[PDB]
Structures are given as C-alpha cells and as structure tokens.
RNA sequence: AGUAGAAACAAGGG
RNA sequence: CCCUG
RNA sequence: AGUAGAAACAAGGG
RNA sequence: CCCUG
C-alpha cells in the first residue's frame, strides 16, 4: 500500500531528493536553526537529500520570474474557470429522470439544476 | 548587574500539571515554541573591546543546538555545548599565564 | 495530516509550522495560497473539475 | 472485540499546547500521574484455560518499567519490554511446530 | 556548607543507609512500582542503601505497638505542654 | 575579553 | 592515563 | 494460550 | 554471524 508507505516516509527528516546546485541557492539553516538539507548523497546517483522545509523556504524565499506565459499555454483550463465564474444558475426542479463539462453538477439522480454557461 | 531589571522581557506559557521540580530545558523549549517572529540577527550596538562576530556565532550556535535536540534517539535532561572556537574565546579559556 | 500542510492561522505545532506561518504572514491575499502552503480550501461541487 | 466499548473508563488530562503529533508515552505517563488510589492487584474473575498468575506478573512488570523510565540519563520515546517468561508465554512464543 | 550538600543528597535515589533486616519487613517495590531499597551494600560496612520512600512506607505500613513509656521518660516535655 | 580591587582569578601536580 | 576542588 | 474457520498463523533458509 | 517479510 503506497499510502501508508508515504505516511511513514514523510515522517523522516529528508524524504525528498534534489540536485547538487540547491546548495548554492538556499541555506543549510532556517532563521530559527532548522536544517534544510544534508551532505549525504543518494545511492546510485549524485543527488542529495532535502526536506520539505526547503520547498517552503523556496516558495517564500527565492528568485522571482514573470509568469505571463502560463495562462497562454494552459488556455483550455483557464477558459473553464472563466466560463464558470461568468455563468448564471437557476432554481432546482425535483422530477423523475459546454454543458457536458459540468454534467456532474447539472443533472442528478432525481433532480435538475438550470445552468447556462457564461460563454 | 548579573541580569537586566527594568528591560527584562519574558516568553510565557501555562503548565497546569503542577510539577514540584521538573527539568528546565523542556520548559525553555516550550516557551521558545510559542514565538514565530524570529529573523536574521545583526549587530546594532557593538561591544567596543571585544570580538562581536563571536557573540553572533554564539547565539546562532545555541539556536542550532536547540534544534539538534529533535533528531536524537532519547531526549536529554541537560544540554552540553560544543567546545567551539567562539565559546573558547568568549568564556576566557586558556588565558591564565 | 499526511503532508503536514496545516492552515496558516491554526495553532498546531509541527516541523513546518514556522515556515508556513511566515509565508502566511508575508502574503497580502490569503485566499491565493495553495492547500500545500497553508492556504484555505476553495473546492466545492461546482469546482471538482478545475 | 479488540477493546471494551460500554465498560471503558479513561484517565483524562489537559494539553493546551496543541501538538500536531507528539510522543504518546509521555502523555500516558502524565495521565497516569493524576491517579492517587492504586493498590495491590488480585484476581477475581480468572481465565479458565490460561495460566492466571502470568497476567498479574505482566501488569506488575509494566508498572515497574514505567517507574524505571525515571532513572535514565535520557528519556526515551518508545519502551521495549524485556523478554520475560510471562511475556514469552502470554505472546505465544515458541508454539509453532 | 552542609545545607546545600543535603539539598543535593536528597536529589539522589538512595541517600539513607539502613541495616539488612529491612529487606524482610518492607517490600522492594511500592503498590505503584517505586523502588524502595537497592541490593548494593554500603562501602566499608554491610549496610544497605534506602530511599526516603522507605521511611513513609514504614510510617503508613508497619508493625504497631503500645507506647505508655515515652511520656514517663520524657516527663519534663509533657509537663511543659500540660502547664501551657 | 571578563570578574575584582591596594592583590588575585582567568586551573594545578605527577 | 591517574589523583585533587 | 490466542487469532481463525472446511485450512492456516502461532517465524523460514543457510 | 548474514540474508529475507
């Protein structure tokens, strides 16, 4: 069972594996003294062991780059959220039993929800 | 004076389990776990006649040693600092003629 | 409870508590943080596909 | 069933310091230290098909180990019981052909 | 300073020294599992180390006797209380 | 460095 | 390495 | 002893 | 003593 395996793996100190250049960007110790990475090398490769505290440190302390391109390449996903935001809902009708994408919310076992997408 | 009197500030906790005499290191750690405003220390008012980076390294060392408590098979009752160079200078080791 | 990415304002003590609290304090809009970075939960029935 | 349902009783304490996942042994000891009514155990309803005194010895052994926890240089996180005769029998050691 | 010396001595496990027949009257463990005396013998003699818990154990659990001889011996002190 | 103040500590012997 | 506060 | 139920666990190899 | 769940 992978679920319990990862439950146990996350309890260790450095369950993540990263490259060697990480040592040049983020420091070995937090502002409180917590360790972020260790000198030990991975078996079979030159990777190093890293802790999730390194991930959080990078997210809150690290280089910034413009992400203008992201919406362009992931256009299909953003179109969905736009349509959902600009849609209009309606009353629920309990009766015997662009639209298919939201099929899990419109139809049901014995009820119908009125929906017209905002696009 | 040995300790500050008017400028003293304390980190406070509440222990309802009234222990007659318990280990103080655990109390210190618990009081330090209620603060989430640590930042990078820096020197603003230096000691004129002393090596200040030694003091800064000493503070960083105690901070690191306290965290090194977690990765132990058994938690200790007392912490023993490592005889490092900055502690050698600050505590006046090897100064008697 | 698996990834230990609790909320930012919750008072649960963990190894990642300090970093998550600092990140929560830094941000301006707390509703944009991922659930992995101690953000709020926005999912609902109408959002289970995004 | 694996545990009692209607007949259960619990010794309760309070922990205002909300720890996400702490060591349960210390919680057990702190809960134990709130009772001041222990006495000498004895057997009133025995087990027909088992050796009763081994259970009593096991209970006394667990109490003794809990008190031994105090006399240690460093406090451990988990307590491994000594492989005694009563624990050898109770846990069915050396019964497979 | 003897005061701090005993302040430290009471912090140990077995500060008190007793005889050997004590092992026959009070048990080695409490009803909760606390050790009372240790097998180690005193240095320079045959006495046995005992913790103060043994004293309270004896006081609350031990042989009883009738005392109608102490006041007669300590007549002056009892007269002092009676006058007061 | 520091304590301390009319002289000392900031370890000693094998 | 031992002894001494 | 105990789990368990049409056959097994209650450790196996060197 | 080693290996294996």
| DSSP codes joined into one string, D42-87 | --SS--TTS-HHHHHHHHHHHHHHHHHTTSSSEEESS------HHH
Testing the interface with E: which of D11, D67, D68, D79 to mutate, by most E Cβ within 10 A?
D67
The two structure tokens encoding residue E45 = 């003699």
In contact, C35 and D41? CB cutoff 8 Å: no
Q: How far apart are CA A42 and CA A19, in angstroms?
A: 10
Technique used: cryo-EM
Q: Which nucleotide is nearest to B95 (CA to C1')?
A: F10
For chain C, the residues whose C-beta falls within 8 A of a C-beta of chain B are 13, 15, 17-18, 21-22
State the smallest CA–CA distance between residue B68 and chain A in angstroms: 8
Interface check D36 vs E, CB under 8 A? no
Residues of chain E found within 8 Å of residue D66, distances taken between Cβ atoms: 33
- Residues (20-79, chain D) with CB within 7 Å of strand H atoms: 47, 49-50
CA angle B27, B37, C22 (to 5 degrees): 120
Query: D78-87: which pairs have CB atoms within 8 A and are 24 or more residues apart?
Result: D78/D25, D79/D25, D84/D57, D85/D54, D86/D53, D86/D54, D86/D55, D86/D57, D86/D58, D86/D61, D87/D58, D87/D61
Residues of chain C found within 8 Å of residue B33, distances taken between Cβ atoms: 13
- Closest-CA residue of D relative to B69 is D74
Whether residues D38 and E32 touch (CB distance < 8 A) is answered with yes
The two structure tokens encoding residue D93 = 């050691």
Residues of chain D found within 8 Å of residue C1, distances taken between Cβ atoms: 20
Spatial CB neighbours of A52, under 8 Å, sequence gap ≥ 6: A10, A15, A16, C3, C4, C16
Q: How far apart are CA B13 and CA E49, in angstroms?
A: 39
Specify the 3-state DSSP secondary structure of B35: coil
Spatial CB neighbours of A117, under 8 Å, sequence gap ≥ 6: A83, A84, A86, A87, A98, A99, A102
Which residue bears the tokens 């809990």?
D66
**Residues for chain B: how many in total?**
97
Whether residues A53 and C16 touch (CB distance < 8 A) is answered with yes
Cα distances (Å, whole numbers) of residue A34 to C11, D74, E43, E70, E80: 19, 22, 49, 67, 69
Is the minimum distance from the CB of D93 to strand H below 7 Å? yes
Spatial CB neighbours of E41, under 8 Å, sequence gap ≥ 6: E47, E48
Sign of torsion, CA A16 A19 A22 A28? positive
- Closest-CA residue of A relative to C24 is A60
**Residues for chain C: how many in total?**
50
Cα distances (Å, whole numbers) of residue A88 to A115, A117, C17, C43, D76: 6, 7, 40, 18, 61
Whether residues B67 and A13 touch (CB distance < 8 A) is answered with no
In contact, C6 and A66? CB cutoff 8 Å: no
Whether residues B75 and D77 touch (CB distance < 8 A) is answered with yes
Residues of chain D found within 8 Å of residue B13, distances taken between Cβ atoms: 17
Is the minimum distance from the CB of D97 to strand H below 7 Å? yes
Q: How far apart are CA D12 and CA D32, in angstroms?
A: 9
CA–C1' distance B83–G4 (Å)?
Answer: 24
The two structure tokens encoding residue B31 = 């009081």
CA dihedral C5→D79→B67→B34, nearest 10 degrees, is: 60
The strand pairing partners of C16, in sequence order, are none
For chain B, the residues whose C-beta falls within 8 A of a C-beta of chain D are 13-14, 16-17, 30, 33, 72-77
Q: How far apart are CA A39 and CA A56, in angstroms?
A: 20
DSSP C16: T
In contact, E32 and D63? CB cutoff 8 Å: yes
Residues of chain D found within 8 Å of residue B73, distances taken between Cβ atoms: 74, 76-77
State the smallest CA–CA distance between residue B29 and chain C in angstroms: 13
**Helix (H) or strand (E) run with residue C24 in it:** helix C17-26
Q: DSSP E strands: which ranges in chain E?
A: 16-18, 37-41, 48-50
Helix H, strand E, coil C: the string for chain A is CHHHHHHHHCCCCCCEEECCCHHHHCCCECCCCCECEEEEECCCCCCEEECHHHHHHHHHCCCCCCCCHHHHHCHHHHHHHHHHHCCEEEEEEECCCCCHHHHHHHECCCEEEEEECCC
The two structure tokens encoding residue B59 = 């503070």
Q: How far apart are CA D17 and CA C13, in angstroms?
A: 8
E80 class by beta-carbon count within 10 Å (0-12 exposed, 13-18 middle, 19+ buried): exposed
Specify the 3-state DSSP secondary structure of B34: coil
Instruction: Give φ, ψ of A69 to 5 degrees.
Output: -70, -30
In contact, B31 and B14? CB cutoff 8 Å: no
Is the minimum distance from the CB of D95 to strand H below 7 Å? yes
Testing the interface with D: which of E32, E36, E49, E57 to mutate, by most D Cβ within 10 A?
E32
Spatial CB neighbours of B46, under 8 Å, sequence gap ≥ 6: B52
């Amino acid at each position: 069972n992978p679920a319990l395996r990862m439950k146990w793996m996350m309890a260790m100190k450095y369950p993540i594996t990263a490259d060697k250049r990480i040592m040049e960007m983020i420091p070995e110790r937090n502002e409180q003294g917590q360790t972020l990475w260790s000198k030990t090398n991975d078996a079979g490769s030159d990777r190093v062991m890293v802790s999730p505290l390194a991930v959080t440190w990078w997210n809150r302390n690290g280089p910034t780059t413009s992400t203008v391109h992201y919406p362009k390449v992931y256009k299909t996903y953003f179109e969905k959220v736009e349509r959902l935001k600009h849609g209009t809902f309606g009353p629920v009708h309990f009766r015997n039993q662009v639209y298919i994408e939201v099929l899990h919310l419109t139809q049901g076992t014995c009820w119908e929800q009125m929906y017209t997408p905002g696009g | 004076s040995k300790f500050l009197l008017m400028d003293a500030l304390a980190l406070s906790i509440e222990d309802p389990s009234h222990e007659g005499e318990g280990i103080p290191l655990y109390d210190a750690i618990k009081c330090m776990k209620t603060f989430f405003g640590w930042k990078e220390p820096n020197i603003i008012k230096p000691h004129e006649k002393g090596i200040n980076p030694n003091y800064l390294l000493t503070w960083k060392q105690v901070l690191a040693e306290l965290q090194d408590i977690e990765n132990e098979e058994k938690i200790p009752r007392t912490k023993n600092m490592k005889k490092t160079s900055q502690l050698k200078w600050a505590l006046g080791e090897n100064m008697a003629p | 409870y698996t990834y230990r990415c609790h909320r930012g304002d919750t008072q649960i003590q963990t190894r990642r508590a300090f970093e998550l609290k600092k990140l929560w304090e830094q941000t301006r809009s707390k509703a944009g943080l991922l659930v992995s970075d101690g953000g709020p939960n926005l999912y609902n029935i109408r959002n289970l596909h995004i």
